[PDB]
């Protein structure tokens, strides 16, 4: 059994596409969104009260 063989198979191993769990990216937090104002309504109303 040493006479050897022939590997005639043409390899076409295509790797599967890996799974991707997309992140819920957040650029500005809610604190920055509330702090991005020259005038805040809650502060004005509290001062008036």
């Amino acid at each position: 059994s040493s006479i050897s063989t022939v590997d005639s198979m043409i390899a076409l191993d295509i790797d599967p596409l890996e799974n991707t769990d997309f992140r819920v990216l957040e650029l500005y937090s809610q604190k920055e969104l509330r702090s991005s104002n020259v005038f805040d309504l809650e502060e004005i109303m509290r001062e008036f009260n």
Binding site: I3, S4, T5, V6, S8, M9
Partner: protein
């Protein structure tokens, strides 16, 4: 060199019902009674 039949080819997930709830953003609204006197 002797062909020996090297090639041996050989060869839902969880269906179900879903109900999606969102976070509530509606502010709680109640009724306030204001008693006051006006002296002019």
């Amino acid at each position: 060199i002797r062909f020996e039949r090297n090639i041996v080819c050989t060869s839902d997930l969880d269906e179900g019902i879903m109900v999606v709830y969102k976070r509530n953003i509606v502010a709680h609204t109640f009724k306030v009674r204001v008693y006051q006197k006006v002296l002019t």
